Amino acid sequence: FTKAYAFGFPKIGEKREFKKALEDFWKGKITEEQFEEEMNKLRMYMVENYRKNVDVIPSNELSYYDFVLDTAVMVGAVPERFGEYRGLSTYFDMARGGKALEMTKFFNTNYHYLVPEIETEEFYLLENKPLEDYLFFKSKGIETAPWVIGPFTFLYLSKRNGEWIRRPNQMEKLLESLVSVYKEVFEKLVENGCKEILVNEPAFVCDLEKAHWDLILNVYRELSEFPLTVFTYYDSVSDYEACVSLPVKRLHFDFVSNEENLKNLEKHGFPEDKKLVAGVINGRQPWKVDLRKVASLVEKLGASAISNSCPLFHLPVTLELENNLPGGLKEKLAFAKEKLEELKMLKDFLEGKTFDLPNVSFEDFAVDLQAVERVRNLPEDSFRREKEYTERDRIQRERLNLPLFPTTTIGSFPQTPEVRKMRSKYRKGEISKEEYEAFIKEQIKKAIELQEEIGLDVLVHGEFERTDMVEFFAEKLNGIATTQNGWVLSYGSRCYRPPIIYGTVTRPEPMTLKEITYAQSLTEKPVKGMLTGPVTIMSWSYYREDIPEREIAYQIALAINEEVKDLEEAGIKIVQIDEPAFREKAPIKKSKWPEYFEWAINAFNLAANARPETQIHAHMCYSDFNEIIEYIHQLEFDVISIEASRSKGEIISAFENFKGWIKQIGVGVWDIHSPAVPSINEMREIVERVLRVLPKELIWINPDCGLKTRNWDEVIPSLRNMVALAKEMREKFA
Ligand SMILES: CN1c2c(nc(N)[nH]c2=O)NC[C@@H]1CNc1ccc(C(=O)N[C@@H](CCC(=O)O)C(=O)O)cc1
Ligand SMILES: OC[C@@H](O)[C@@H](O)CO
Ligand SMILES: [Zn+2]
């Protein structure tokens, strides 16, 4: 007998029923009851999928917005500003709206959670959702195992006084009070018959201190009386010996995303006092695996229980109706529903119930020898611009003849319902491409004119033809495929359909040329080329595992570089390469950062390798540059724009203190996440802070980020004040 486990199965339903229900409720289209009944169908849909494939069925997985927020509600972490928790009404105020909690990335994944704000040092059992959901399935005669966020990881994901609660001294006191509530929750589940509880402590995979592990042993020592199974994933655990020594009867490890866990089990063994749960089915990638090989690994591991490596909610629900993918691909793929089915076949195999497992051995599958070699043979000169910055700067400044404190925008412009509708019609064939492109050139023509009237120095074409900064390029790249229903939960009710890099990436034809070229031909001021970095394109989509990441990134980098060259040949003087994944795709363990940035930097520069006369701009959304400034300094851009409105310029600190800094900085002086219009006096404060040490010739004035989420009547005013501020500054220093 091989006990099979599974967790994180998508909650969105096969037709985004979850999305429709959430939004129907917020609109007031359905009652809270109808909403609840809709959620209950999803519960049954999820539970029946588990029932048909694994032995342990999870409960408490259908979060109405976020499971970390759910955890916060359970332990009473509800900030004073929300008043008395009334229920769903209060819950959704914490999740969305003007008083909502902060939203941030859940580890190195594309899912986003809500950061709890701990205002009091004492926790209490406010609502026992684990017990609720448990009983619900019990009504249906289904025994389930509550899925919960462990106490350590909960605190690790939360903030106090706006700061991470990640230091042992910061957690100690809190942990004692907190564990108490978990103790109540667990004691109530066991009283009602709960036989097993799934605890998630993914934070165990972060670069922890021996001091953290003393705390962890402490916490779980107080919970040893309960039937707990601990899960860890996304990377190897920071201290193997300490972790397997925890007083828990069963431990789960991620044996897919890292090779460290295996080597440690091989070196130190595994305690015969507990049971190993081998997470051997990838939960972040969509590929079929040779189950024969996975089977031998399980035997090697000595485990008698299996499961997916990490949560399955990073994958689409099912591959069943994906019948329009490139030839041969579908046979190599496998989504959430298929992974579940993979654990069943693995279970039957190991138990000797079946002696036949599928082939799955794609190797020479969709490969372009010419392009693969064309990348592997790249000379050192491929990652370095012909001339150092100082020289490129003079050439560029003479070619652009820009005034002091020039102004510009980061990229996307608001897309009124009219352009939003037109894209729909086009997508549905309700319009002719010939007429669609004509509609775009119309929005572009209008945008260019509006920018000149306002007084901007460097213009952008608006990006009206782009919905997603990755999807747009992914759809024009060979070796990449797009699904029809592969929706993955990004956060709340927002879903993304990540592309699939299944083969050697190459760019068969110009991707943005017509739009840029057109916009430039409407004015004499410079218009920015708009490109997405290689790492970001890769990071937002799924990709082949049988080859090193860096290779795939370099392949995409090549494609992007060819585009940069076409832009130069076509006369574009400024090209921007937005690489938000630069820091987001970095390993969870900062200790593994040096290796990663080595090839991330290379990938960016290979793509950004433009002629010296071409000014390269790079936009970084990050709120702090202290921990990556050393890596950023190796990127060969000529201008970097940051978001300085929130910190009111204080974010420039990382740059001031970086001895030798000399590149231009686009100072974001307007928080585009707010509808308000910042005053000239407000933007001025920011620009004055940045001019405290850095030479005034380095400064560019621009908005924090893209404007696609704003309204034209908020943009115009703001842009106008921005230009005005530019003129005032330019008169005080010239
Ligand atoms: C991978 N994501 C990502 C990112 N930005 C960063 N920095 N990192 C990321 O990982 N931007 C896109 C996406 C997360 N953000 C979003 C934002 C909105 C929607 C959204 O509203 N999606 C629509 C469908 C949009 C369409 O028509 O394609 C939805 O209702 O699901 C999805 C994801
Ligand atoms: O080390 C991972 C941490 O920085 C966060 O991304 C966890 O969500
Ligand atoms: Zn940004």
Residue numbers in the entry: 0 to 733
Anything the authors wrote about it?
The fold of the N-terminal barrel confirms that it has evolved from the C-terminal polypeptide by gene duplication; comparisons of the barrels provide an intriguing example of homologous domain evolution in which binding sites are obliterated.
Structures of CH3-H4folate bound to MetE from T. maritima have been determined in both the reduced (zinc-replete) enzyme and the oxidized (disulfide-bonded) form. In the zinc-replete complexes of MetE with folate that provide resting-state structures of the zinc site, the metal–ligand cluster adopts tetrahedral geometry. The observed Zn–S bond lengths in our structure are 2.30 Å, Zn–N is 2.07 Å, and Zn–O is 2.14 Å, in good agreement with the EXAFS measurements. In the binary complexes with MetE that we report here, the pterin ring of the folate is stacked against Trp539, Lys104 hydrogen bonds to O4, and the folate N5 is hydrogen bonded to a water molecule. In the binary complex with CH3-H4folate, the DMV loop is also recruited to the position it occupies when Hcy is bound. The orientation of bound folate in the binary complexes does not allow transfer of the methyl group to Hcy.
